[PDB]
Design an enzyme around this catalytic site. Structure first.
Site, mmCIF file in Angstrom:
data_model
loop_
_atom_site.group_PDB
_atom_site.id
_atom_site.type_symbol
_atom_site.label_atom_id
_atom_site.label_comp_id
_atom_site.label_asym_id
_atom_site.label_seq_id
_atom_site.Cartn_x
_atom_site.Cartn_y
_atom_site.Cartn_z
ATOM 1 N N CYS B 93 0.832 -1.197 0.000
ATOM 2 C CA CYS B 93 0.000 0.000 0.000
ATOM 3 C C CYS B 93 0.870 1.252 0.000
ATOM 4 O O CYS B 93 1.160 1.818 1.055
ATOM 5 C CB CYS B 93 -0.938 0.010 1.210
ATOM 6 S SG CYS B 93 -2.082 1.411 1.263
ATOM 7 N N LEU B 94 1.289 1.674 -1.188
ATOM 8 C CA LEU B 94 2.127 2.858 -1.325
ATOM 9 C C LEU B 94 1.438 3.896 -2.205
ATOM 10 O O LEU B 94 0.695 3.547 -3.123
ATOM 11 C CB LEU B 94 3.495 2.485 -1.898
ATOM 12 C CG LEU B 94 4.559 3.581 -1.924
ATOM 13 C CD1 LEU B 94 4.675 4.241 -0.560
ATOM 14 C CD2 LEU B 94 5.899 3.013 -2.362
#
Ligand SMILES: [K+]
Lengths: 106, 158
Positions: B93-94
């Site tokens: 989750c970037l």
């Protein structure tokens, strides 16, 4: 833009191998030193790798074993020079000598 | 079209081979037939020196779409890691991995790997992906770092 150099080569996909495709055809005939041959299938499938140790296990196998058929499209890109080449496969079993391949050409 | 994607991917591979940060690995995975897939890469990120992640070689997978580079690739840790911004599946989750925010088509694979590496030592509390990782981090920070150091030496290259 953009007309990439494109040729047609007649051979038997069940006879010629990847190594013969690499050395005899792409490198020897079409003057490449470190080619990366990719099968234009929309999957980004690369058959021949310039990097040693990666695709040295495909050399003995025939082209047909990789789904390469009549009308197949191959993109050879040289790693040591800006050289891209689109090679079309015209499967022909009647060659004569028998020779390995022929560029039409020529 | 895939033609735009595969052309961009071709630039990425050649640029990576000629020059890439030490410790990092990025190579198209091998297809069952023996060939390799340009749209599927096996990657490996080295832990940052001076950090609890140091000494670890963490492996992930890059999955490219035909929309690339208009769309970012799916980065997937294999196996999944203990990290707040990493979903239990292994997905990262970037911010730069979402086309709806902070993603530019001009971003190199290198810049992504270097981006994920920083996310390891410096997790974002804003978007919690993993349950227990987010919990221990915001509570027992000492315990959290012990988990990371144990994980780094667990994934030590040998
Ligand atoms: K070999």
């Amino acid at each position: 833009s953009a007309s990439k150099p494109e040729v047609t080569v007649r051979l038997n996909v069940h006879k010629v191998t990847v190594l013969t495709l690499q050395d005899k055809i792409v490198k020897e005939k079409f003057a490449m030193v470190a080619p990366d041959v990719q099968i234009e299938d929309g999957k980004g499938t690369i058959l021949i790798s310039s990097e040693e140790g990666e695709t040295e296990a495909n050399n003995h196998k025939k082209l047909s074993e990789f789904g390469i058929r009549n009308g197949s499209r191959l993109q050879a890109d040289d790693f040591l020079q800006d050289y891209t080449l689109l090679i079309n496969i015209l499967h022909s079993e009647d060659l004569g000598k028998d020779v390995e391949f022929e560029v039409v050409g020529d | 079209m895939s033609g735009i994607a595969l052309s961009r991917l071709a630039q990425e591979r050649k640029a990576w081979r000629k020059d890439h940060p030490f410790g990092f690995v990025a190579v198209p995975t091998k297809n069952p037939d023996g060939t390799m897939n340009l749209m599927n890469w096996e990657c490996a990120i080295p832990g940052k020196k001076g950090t609890p992640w140091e000494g670890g070689l963490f492996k992930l997978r890059m999955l490219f779409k035909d929309d690339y580079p208009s769309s970012p690739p799916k980065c997937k840790f294999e196996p999944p890691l203990f990290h707040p911004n990493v979903y239990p599946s292994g997905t990262v989750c970037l911010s730069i991995l979402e086309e709806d925010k902070d993603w530019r088509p001009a971003i190199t694979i290198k810049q992504i790997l270097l981006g994920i590496q920083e996310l390891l030592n410096e997790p974002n509390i804003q978007d919690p992906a993993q349950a227990e990782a987010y919990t221990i981090y915001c509570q027992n920070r000492v315990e959290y770092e012990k988990r990371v150091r144990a994980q780094a030496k667990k994934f030590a290259p040998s």
